[PDB]
UniProtKB/Swiss-Prot annotation:
UniProt EC number: 1.7.-.-, 1.11.1.-
Gene Ontology BP, a term: oxygen transport
Protein name: Myoglobin
GN (gene name): MB
The keyword Iron belongs to this UniProt entry's keyword annotation: yes
Organism in which the protein naturally occurs: Equus caballus (Horse)
Catalytic activity: Fe(III)-heme b-[protein] + nitric oxide + H2O = Fe(II)-heme b-[protein] + nitrite + 2 H(+); H2O2 + AH2 = A + 2 H2O
One Gene Ontology term, aspect cellular component: sarcoplasm
Length: 152
């Protein structure tokens, strides 16, 4: 649950992402894959990537980064009223991709890391607080659907 002022911070930060969605999406996935190499094994189309240089050179990884952040941005713009947008993603990630909630924690922290890396000194403590709360809400509502499905 976020206040109006917190949502305003989230959507202000998101403007930074929308200026370069592919570059942000690429770096988020690279941070996930290099920090948590077990996550790469869930992607049949990226498991061939052995080095970060190959990851950086992969145009399909940048494409998928655009898909991921476009979906997340659509959810964030609903300011919590995201049941219709979130349900299909919860279902596909639990039942088809088999993504444990832990990996959603990993990618949430990766987003925070990338924002500081690309905007050092321009991602203030209030903005980090609000973005963190928004990603916690996203993860918590996914977790509720995971529990319904019995997925661990
Ligand atoms: C912010 C969190 C995430 C968002 C918004 C997101 C979004 C998406 C979307 C929109 C798709 C394509 C449609 C679909 O299959 O539902 C997708 C596919 C997929 N996601 Fe995610 N995802 C997220 C996190 C993760 C994480 C953490 C993992 C694994 C560590 C993951 C694994 C996958 C896989 C394996 C696919 C299929 C890729 C393919 O072969 O095309 N997702 N995701």
């Amino acid at each position: 649950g976020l206040s109006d002022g917190e949502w305003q911070q989230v959507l202000n930060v998101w403007g930074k992402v929308e200026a370069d969605i592919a570059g942000h999406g690429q770096e988020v996935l690279i941070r996930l894959f290099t920090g948590h190499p077990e996550t790469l094994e869930k992607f049949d189309k990226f498991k061939h990537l052995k080095t970060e240089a190959e990851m950086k050179a992969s145009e399909d990884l940048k494409k998928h980064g655009t898909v991921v952040l476009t979906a997340l941005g659509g959810i964030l713009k609903k300011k919590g009223h995201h049941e219709a947008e979130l349900k299909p993603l919860a279902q596909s990630h639990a039942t088809k991709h088999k993504i444990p909630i832990k990996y959603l924690e990993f990618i949430s922290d990766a987003i925070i890391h990338v924002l500081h890396s690309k905007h050092p000194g321009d991602f203030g403590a209030d903005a980090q607080g609000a973005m963190t709360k928004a990603l916690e809400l996203f993860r918590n509502d996914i977790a509720a659907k995971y529990k319904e499905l019995g997925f661990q």
